[model samples]
Target: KDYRKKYRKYVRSRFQCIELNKRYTRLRLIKEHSPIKMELLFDPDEPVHTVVFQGAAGIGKTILARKMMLDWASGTLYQDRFDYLFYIHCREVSLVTQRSLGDLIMSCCPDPNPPIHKIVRKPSRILFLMDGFDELQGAFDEHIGPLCTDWQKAERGDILLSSLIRKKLLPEASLLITTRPVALEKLQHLLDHPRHVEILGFSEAKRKEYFFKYFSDEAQARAAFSLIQENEVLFTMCFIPLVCWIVCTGLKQQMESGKSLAQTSKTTTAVYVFFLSSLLCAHLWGLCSLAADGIWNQKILFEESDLRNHGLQDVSAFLRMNLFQKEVKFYSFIHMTFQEFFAAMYYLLEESRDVTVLLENYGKFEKGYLIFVVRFLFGLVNQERSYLEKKLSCKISQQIRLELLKWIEVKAKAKKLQIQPSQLELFYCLYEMQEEDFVQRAMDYFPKIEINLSTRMDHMVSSFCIENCHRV
Candidate 1:
């Protein structure tokens, strides 16, 4: 009991709700008419033993899990219900080659040594929360391997995970897993009758709450929200919490620094590009050049001192630190999106890059990362005295733009290239340029693909594109 109290307190303190533009510490819940509050979803009397929460990248799945943990600890949720709750990150667990389930729980325990036997004895009283299954590499291989039910046999971490999920380890224990929608297929057959939940992220009201919560000054918050509304693409993207943070942070800084928001953030990419440039200060070019090297090498993690040379210091808000081996500290971009954005910025700063080589070798990069990089590059070169020059001390050369335009034209002719996701991204790039002539020329070049206007982002981007592209 004492251990549970200490553990709960530790987690609650470690994970405070991130309040950026609003004053509220708790997220508003959108409950069904028959509203089983999230906690009640795992009632002891409930038949479901496994619950899977899935969402798109950067949605608040992890945050919701953390919130549940905090609520359970505070006696506000799961009171007199769960006896022990264990929270594990799949990315951290993947790093452990060999460790028993007992060892795994101990690693996360706030106390020096926990009574693993006592805790697991009554499995029904325990809850296991696993977050970020999508971040794991070789997920299929790990899941397909042999299961080890007994702690003594489950020496390997991956095998132990298989046992836990397969219910061979603790059959009676309740499990709550969070993963991105892309990884749901891998876990579909693992558990039977698992309650599936999809996090749709912030609603319109929640978005407004977030803006107000993040900014203390009402005027500042209102102005930022208004600007995002004017740009349909950005307003729709703000549904994702991470994008909301980026937009609010960038807009706040722009306003505070006496910069013109209209001039600096004319497009979606422009805002991020401007934000990165502003964050790096005078070291913008050097860091971008460094980012290009990292991208080419496919290196995501960097040594702190290694990055410091490029003006990225220990104090950088954009960089997050992780203890790689208990002794060595490694730094990486706060989110994968930022890393891709910076890598794209690198190409824009360079004098020239072969468009053919870039398109051909796109598979070398993660499809997710490549999509944004291409869009950002197009945005960088779109306008005269583009934000690249005015904000980031960089400019896209006409030689490079012409090379890219020619390559895009050639790719449009090939049947094989017509089906690639890059085709839609190409439309967005041309859309950012805001040049009717350029967009019209590429209209015939575009494939007859059915765009899903059901998605908020796709709807906004396509609607904006049609209005701008068709206008004389």
Candidate 2:
């Protein structure tokens, strides 16, 4: 009787959810090369038990997940089909060293109780929403011994979570997981017949919609959208929600400062450099050094003392700090992309020896989170004095750029090239330079090579190679 009363109070608050209706527009979905609405995808009649949504960093997977939760909460999605919806984020979940499923439920809820035993009795009416599987600190090992089949049973947090994913517990509960493509490999074969959806970002039409929404003045919106449209690569990159925000806001800032948007937004590198310039202004070098130290140590989350040692204070704009446990605090770049950009800048500013090592092992490094490190590094090789120099007082040497290009050209010219020419890393380095004539000179030494458009990055880079490096 007491359990029922507590459970009734628990369900009244609706799982202690947050407001997600602010600034949210609809997102598009695709399946099998065909466009689909969110309604059809989440329809209970589809018989899809497990769904995995994949995208690159900052592509708005979390927002979509939150939106789904909102819909479910508001009785707009699966209202009759699902009795309970538990939204779990892996970043927060990583902090749970040890806990049972019942404990986990109570911890996430506003009320410290649940009729978990009775709830698990009818698992078919439950839904588990897990976000950021890639951010999980430790690997999911199945050998933690047999998982507890009951919701009230005790187990390690990772094991308990894995059990729910593996369907050893609450087998009838529906599951929705979000992760990056890189982390999807870790989850391979973990679930039976899980449906996969890749977020391709906003379409061109939607990009216009977003720009208009972002910029109040119609004139400013048209100017910003036009600037993006002029640059093929930059426009294509705007498909990403975060990148779109960066580009639009960066351009708007430049325009408000009475600067020519066309002059600064010519290349992705220029836009990012300008964006950072706008953010850091005179404090650019200090933060770059701090970011470099963090990247060198392979540390994303930093201690408050560590941040203070690096001269970072009141860094709310560019950095995010979280209080863990009771008083311990840690910091991180607002986004991993921003971290990589600063890390790349750090190499150039500090003149580090790792640049050589990075250029040599592009293939291996490309697979890691540092995927954009080299691209950003190569983009820093501007000959003329640009905004980056005004801020940092120095830039990467032209000699280093020439040396890297010379090596690539030499390999491309080799009668029997020791390495494949179609590597995505090679294309990214060349494409990021943003000089068609230079690419033309490099292609003069090339031999015909077969390119595989296997991954998302491969398709983008290979398209650039085909357009500029090949005649047909």
Candidate 3:
């Protein structure tokens, strides 16, 4: 009950809208009805019990997966065909953990002490919703199995493939895996019956329903909805709930600021980086606080002075090294956007050893920086919170406060620069209150300088192998 309360609070605070939640509300009916193409999904002869959902980021896959579980558990999904529905999140058992299929089976099964004879074992009857296979990072991907194998080791099997191959254990059991499209292709060799179900985000009709449900006053809701559709990025991003929330919050702020929508998205990637960078920065500050107060030894302590000689590259390396030191091995972000933002921050600000000190350092940013950001952003949706939280150790995070402070000071001092506290208000709206209101407010001081490195960054980080062992 406590868990459900906290979960509801977080959802309400985060989304502030009804469209995605509406989709969530109907999962069971959708699974039973297969609303998009009900006839095809309802056909009695359909042998493929396992359904694979694939789509771009923010396209509504996770909620749909959860709805399936609710319906099956309620004795509503596939009412005549499925006797049970078991939903297992792949994140619960990370890819590199070396858990066997039997182990996974036991992990998902309720009532660990049920009588063996009474509990008839049938993996097929339960529907597995394995979400986010492509977002696996660090050492997570090392154990994924090949597509052709019979599934001896769980890690060696195709990444988005446990549902299909586990059929051997319960040949008649049904499976449904939802993930980003790119993740699906990464293990294409493993998927034999690749029937893909696509999620196109919220339909135009549903968008209206969502707005009115949230902002009950019809006139106000229509105004906000109209403004949302006016911005292209806002419209596209609304497909994913996380991005939608960000864009919506940003829109509200902009409306309050009274600035018309700019010609382009004001660094969506940059906003994302700021979010993660704040977390990494705060994590480092907490540990530094511990060290300063003598709660921790100074051996692994990193002060702002430590980053004087380093830039973004050094920060990435520093964060990786400190990931384990600060005792943050697995902290999760609210969404993939945060991860993408972090990668961008690290790349854009990476330390350059061979510094000609031009305003920007594209090589380092492009090589390690861009590729990492792309992978994180385009990876998938709904990451395992535990898996993320585990990676937040002292070794993988950096103390970026000093550099950040220095940059703020420099921006504040620029004579020709026009910066204001009000411009930076977006930072506060997106997060909880903190002690760093000065830094948060100081972002307004930044000059309206647009960096046009998009095409160059893309060109530099192509998939082709380069001399320095770099490829996007």
Candidate 4:
């Protein structure tokens, strides 16, 4: 019963997304689920077994999950219900070839001698938080394997999870799961009924407040915030706190070094690519390899042993050199986006830099998280910035740059494609190049075009493309 204190510390976040009340919007299910307040998550009289939160890759699902656990432990939320809450890291689910669900739940508790039997007895009082359903492969596969209805039965971890999800076991236990929007469809098939909520990331005010908080000196913060404000896309991008951290981290260093931050880190992709270029010379290859494998395996969060397995114990000294630090047993990229960025860096910097496979992966799942890696690839390939030449000690690839342009032409033609190129993705990729002359040539195939700037970022990107368009 005293697990609350330990659980509080276990779930407490370092930089919690804050009480900015991270914006939320209801997507599916009933009308009574109004008031997107944290305290009222289980407010409805009808017991909601599963509450699914869907958000973009880096939009702070993990943060929200931790925050909920913190609030629950503190007695501010879910007070009247849920005698016990178990945090199940969906990333760690696949490690065991077979394990009883009882043992797995044993891992979730902070107490060594947790009330495991008591948990089994009071099924209705439990709430299981399944973080990162997307990390687990074959989640909604055609074959869900045999569901093990018995909780103590040893079985494939994912299979045991399928039983829990299918409600073939512990049907009364409540579940709160998080996933990227891409995985939502697959996750939906397994759910009997669920309340779908989308994380809207940081609101405009929250984004602004985030900057002010990041820098203690209000004037300096405002100075930095003003610069970000001028770049509408970046300001909008900062809505995702992970990118905001990158921006703040990069900009603050520039401030400390007495250098012009604007000259180097103008775009969000630029900031990330620049950081990648810097990290390469610093010799974090072991760390980058860890990130690469995670991307390939669809894993994000890693336990302590996972880091030790990667020889990060030595490089673990340098892990704290940046944002991808360890928190207790868990070691994750600052966010999923950064992991993809770091993975892209690994491919580009490695001797066996398989550019073809990288591009093909994007072509295969153009909408998945891989686009981030592709964007970083394009960003790092900049003719003007020339990160390969200047930072990573590698010669710039003119061949790949032209290859990328042709790829853009094909994709643009395929889309017939929203703004003259029509696709915002096209604009973003072209924008990532950051060379006006090169971007001009990429625009050669498109006709005189009209744009309906739908958003601030859209407006910002369109302006960059429009200025580069010699035809217009």
* Candidate number achieving the greatest lDDT relative to the actual structure: 4
TM-score attained by model 3? 0.52
The pairs that clash in candidate 1 are 20-214, 21-212, 21-213, 21-214, 21-215, 22-212, 22-213, 22-214, 23-213
Give the alpha carbon lDDT tens digit for every residue of 1-472 in model 2: 3553444344435433322144555556666526666656655434777878887777888778877766766667776777667778775664237677777666645555556666666778777888888666544544555666877777777778878778787777888888876667566557767777777778789888889888878998898899878877677777778778788766766777866767345445676776765654444555676666765554556677876786767455444321111211755665666766776776666334456655454323122345566667667765542656644325345556666677677656555322233355567667677667666666666676557554444567667766886655
- In candidate 3, clashing pairs total 45
lDDT of 3 by residue, 201-292 (tens): 56555655556655556775677678667765445444455554454444444445556543233234433432333334434433222222
Model 4 Cα RMSD, Å?
A: 5.5
For residues 1-472, write the lDDT of model 1, one tens digit per residue.
7567777887676555531112333443332202236767775344678888876667776677777777787787777768877888675675337788788778768778777777777888888998876655333443456677776454566578777877788788888888775567566767666877667677778888788888878988888788777876677777888778778876766787766665235566766765654554345555565555555555455666657666655334433321111111565555555665666666666433454555664423123235456666666666552334655324444555666677667666665632343454566676566555666666656555446553576665666555543535
Per residue, candidate 4 scores C-alpha lDDT tens digits across 153-252 of 9988767878888778799888888887656656677886777777767767877777887887998888888877887567777767677767777677
Worst 10 residues of 4 by lDDT: 24-33
Arrange candidates, best TM-score first.
4, 2, 1, 3
- RMSD of each candidate relative to the true structure: 5.3, 5.7, 15.4, 5.5
Checking candidate 4 for backbone clashes, the offending pairs are: 418-422, 418-423, 419-422
Residue 210, model 4: Cα distance from true site in angstroms? 1.3
Cα distance off (Å), candidate 3, residue 38: 6.6
Q: Which stretches of model 3 miss by more than 4 angstroms?
A: 1-46, 114-120, 137-166, 216-220, 252-330, 350-372, 375-472
lDDT of each: 0.63, 0.65, 0.39, 0.67
lDDT score for candidate 2 against the true structure: 0.65
